[PDB]
Design a protein around this ligand. Structure first.
Ligand SMILES: *[C@@H]1O[C@H](CO)[C@@H](O[C@@H]2O[C@H](CO)[C@@H](O)[C@H](O)[C@H]2NC(C)=O)[C@H](O)[C@H]1NC(C)=O
Ligand code: NAG
Length: 341
């Protein structure tokens, strides 16, 4: 048994994108043309050195990498790549960007520099901030590469959580005003501020559905809602996130799949007197439940025993009823009512 994972695809493609400032609308980013979105030049703009491009995704996916591609503009000097696990609230940064290693601590924090030690470490790289390439500049943030977990992902919850997301945001804080226009720019001269802005011509986010290792394909069940995907769950899981077992399969607790075992849901046993059940840890630890083979190696509890039956596996007769010796536990007549005197 091993984990199953649906293919990666471009989360960008069918997402909602927005820009705090814009005048080349935002869409040009996520579409596939050579067109592009472009912020208002520092010229008639004071705080237009701080913009925010935002992508909203349907559900919550696992993001493998965010790739930005700049057009008529050099990469920015200071920006923040942020995600969201809410659908637009408690943001969190993924990585920080700065030209001067000192700028990091000055603008972000003292600790924002230590190398990656723990799967959910943030960081403040420089590399992607050297104005040098001032045209078609590409940045590739890989949320997985490096991290200690990438090795044995399956057993690294921190990473798995670090990579989830609902919204992804590009927070630009300061243009990469380099060369020697500093004085002009600082002074606010319309010969330097009219050649400084932001230009994205493509935002490509590689990610995939979340299925806890119980599915290798997830499509859209409804043609009318082409972007809401649902896992084609396996391992007897259910939920379209495969986060729960299916009716009838609760002998064991639910688990995501690891490299070692599929961890598929086991079927509880109700001697043909029930349609559903639930897992009770106490019962399992107490060894008081029959599995399919009739051994007490589980924790399944039948709900609504039918046929005047009752018990963890509906193996007994409700008090007041008696078991027909001429009948087997599965008979819909196992238990007969009290006879006349
Ligand atoms: C740019 O995006 C940032 C998100 O990083 C926004 O910052 C938030 O601004 C609100 C103002 O109501 C504050 O309450 C939040 O605390 C800010 N987030 C932070 C840094 O904690 C900002 O509003 C956006 N501005 C632009 C460019 O439109
Ligand atoms: C994954 O983690 C398990 C338990 O922590 C460990 O036995 C296994 O060797 C790890 N995978 C590898 C080889 O990195």
């Amino acid at each position: 048994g091993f984990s199953l994972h649906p293919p990666y695809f471009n989360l960008a493609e069918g997402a909602r994108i927005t820009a705090s400032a814009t005048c080349h609308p935002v869409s040009n980013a996520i579409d596939g043309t050579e067109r592009w979105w472009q912020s208002p030049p520092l010229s008639r703009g004071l705080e237009y050195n701080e913009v925010n491009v935002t992508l909203d995704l349907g559900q919550v996916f696992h993001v493998a990498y965010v790739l930005i591609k700049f057009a008529n503009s050099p990469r920015p000097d200071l920006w923040v790549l942020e995600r969201s696990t809410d659908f637009g609230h408690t943001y969190q940064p993924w990585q920080f960007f700065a030209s001067s290693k000192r700028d990091c601590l000055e603008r972000f924090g003292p600790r924002t520099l230590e190398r990656i030690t723990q799967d959910d470490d943030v960081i403040c790289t420089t590399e992607y901030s050297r104005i040098v390439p001032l045209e078609n500049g590409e940045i590739v943030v890989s949320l997985v590469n490096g991290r200690p977990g990438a090795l044995n992902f399956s057993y690294s919850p921190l990473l798995r959580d670090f990579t989830k997301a609902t919204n992804i945001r590009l927070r630009f804080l300061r243009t990469n005003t380099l060369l020697g226009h500093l004085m002009g720019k600082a002074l606010r001269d319309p010969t330097v501020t009219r050649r400084y802005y932001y230009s994205i011509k493509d935002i490509s986010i590689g990610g995939r559905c979340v299925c806890h290792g119980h599915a290798d394909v997830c499509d859209a069940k409804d043609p009318l809602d082409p972007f809401r995907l649902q896992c084609a769950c396996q391992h007897n899981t259910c939920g379209g996130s495969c986060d729960r077992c299916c009716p009838g399969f609760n002998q064991q607790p639910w688990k995501p799949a690891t490299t070692d075992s599929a961890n598929e849901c086991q079927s509880c046993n109700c001697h043909g007197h029930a349609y559903d059940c639930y897992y009770d840890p106490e019962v399992d630890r107490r060894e008081a439940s029959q599995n399919q083979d009739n051994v007490y190696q589980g924790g399944g509890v039948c709900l609504d025993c039918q046929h005047h039956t009752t018990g963890i596996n509906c193996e007994r007769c409700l008090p007041g009823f008696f078991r027909a010796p001429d009948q087997p536990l599965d008979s819909p007549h196992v238990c007969r009512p009290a006879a006349a005197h």
